[PDB]
Amino acid sequence: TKKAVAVLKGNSNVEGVVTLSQDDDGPTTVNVRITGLAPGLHGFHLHEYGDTTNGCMSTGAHFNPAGDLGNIVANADGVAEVTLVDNQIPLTGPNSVVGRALVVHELEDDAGGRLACGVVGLTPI
Amino acid sequence: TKKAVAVLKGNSNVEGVVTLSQDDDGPTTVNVRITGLAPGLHGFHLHEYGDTTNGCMSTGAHFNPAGDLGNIVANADGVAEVTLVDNQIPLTGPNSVVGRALVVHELEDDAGGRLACGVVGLTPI
Ligand SMILES: [Zn+2]
Ligand SMILES: [Zn+2]
Numbered sequence: 593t594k595k596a597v598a599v600l601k602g603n604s605n606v607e608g609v610v611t612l613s614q615d616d617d618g619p620t621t622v623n624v625r626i627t628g629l630a631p632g633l634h635g636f637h638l639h640e641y642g643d644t645t646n647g648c649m650s651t652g653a654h655f656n657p658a659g660d661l662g663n664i665v666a667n668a669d670g671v672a673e674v675t676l677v678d679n680q681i682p683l684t685g686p687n688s689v690v691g692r693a694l695v696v697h698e699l700e701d702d703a704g705g706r707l708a709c710g711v712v713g714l715t716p717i
Numbered sequence: 718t719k720k721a722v723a724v725l726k727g728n729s730n731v732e733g734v735v736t737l738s739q740d741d742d743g744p745t746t747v748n749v750r751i752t753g754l755a756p757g758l759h760g761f762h763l764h765e766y767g768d769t770t771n772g773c774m775s776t777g778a779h780f781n782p783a784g785d786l787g788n789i790v791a792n793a794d795g796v797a798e799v800t801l802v803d804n805q806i807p808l809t810g811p812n813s814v815v816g817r818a819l820v821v822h823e824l825e826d827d828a829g830g831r832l833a834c835g836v837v838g839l840t841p842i
Contacts, residue, residue: 596816599769609770642815642838644724645734652841691721691767691815691839711836713767714816716777 594683597715598694600626602648602708608672610694612683612712620681622661625673626696626708629666635701636661638681639693639709648706651693657686663701672696690714719808722840723819725751727773727833733797735819737808737837745806747786750798751821751833754791760828761786763806764818773831776818781805788826815839 596612608626624636638659639651654660658680664672682688689712698704721737733751749761763784764776779785783805789797807813814837823829 597768597770641840642836643722643840644838645722645840650840691837693838711767711838712816713769713818713836715766715768715770715775 593717595715595717596683596690596712598710598712600694600696600708600710602706604628604707606696606708608696608708610710611715612681614683619677619679620683622676622678622681624664624676626664627671629670629672629696629707631666631668631670633663633665633700634672635697635699635703636664637695637697638689639695642691642693642711644693644709644711648695648709651695651706651709655689655692660701664696718842720840720842721808721815721837723835723837725819725821725833725835727831729753729832731821731833733833735835736840737806739806739808744802744804745808747801747803747806749789749801750796751789751791752796754795754797754821754832756791756793756795758788758790758825759797759832760822760824760826761789762820762822763814764820764834767816767818767836769834769836773820773834776820776831776834780814780817782812785826789821
């Protein structure tokens with residue numbers, strides 16, 4: 593019933609797309625496909641600002657109305673493809689993540705540099 | 718007081734930054750700086766979806782639920798720097814443009830190709 597998407601890019605080879613879906617006020621399903629990553633674990637976070645004026649550093653700190661979506665795993669080919677179900681990622685209401693940012697980190701979830709990021713935007717239901 | 722920003726990019730030479738500011742429920746101040754434009758008038762619109770998975774076409778239609786910000790003017794050097802005031806751009810509430818898209822068009826306000834676009838995101842202050 594509510595959907596969002598983020599296109600991730602940064603000052604690196606890392607690119608991808610994340611789709612988010614939430615039915616009513618239930619859990620948010622997050623579909624991740626990110627390429628160009630070093631094989632292994634990468635922290636995956638919601639950060640507070642949908643601001644990329646200064647690259648991924650403009651996105652501020654992790655979002656804490658919560659912001660930690662855990663690790664995503666890149667395979668030998670640099671691809672991280674996974675579906676997550678996270679209950680703390682509203683698409684509506686006071687704590688909505690719409691207009692905030694998703695960031696993929698260089699190192700495993702505590703972090704390292706912010707490899708890529710994208711603003712969370714509304715998308716057709 | 719709420720603020721938003723959009724970084725605009727597209728399949729073209731056009732890029733820039735737009736900030737939006739709103740106090741209580743009143744008029745929204747829009748600060749524009751876009752470069753790489755052909756000199757003259759360019760349609761400047763709010764579109765429905767902050768979805769750039771298919772470039773600027775995936776932002777959908779111009780959004781009203783208002784979405785027509787009029788023209789911006791690119792100077793001899795392709796720079797359009799202007800401050801607009803618009804009372805149809807909520808940054809809060811049911812009609813928030815947060816998570817939607819700003820689009821700059823090839824031609825004067827209908828508007829030809831979508832030269833550049835960006836997702837409207839939250840930013841400090
Ligand atoms: Zn982080
Ligand atoms: Zn338009």
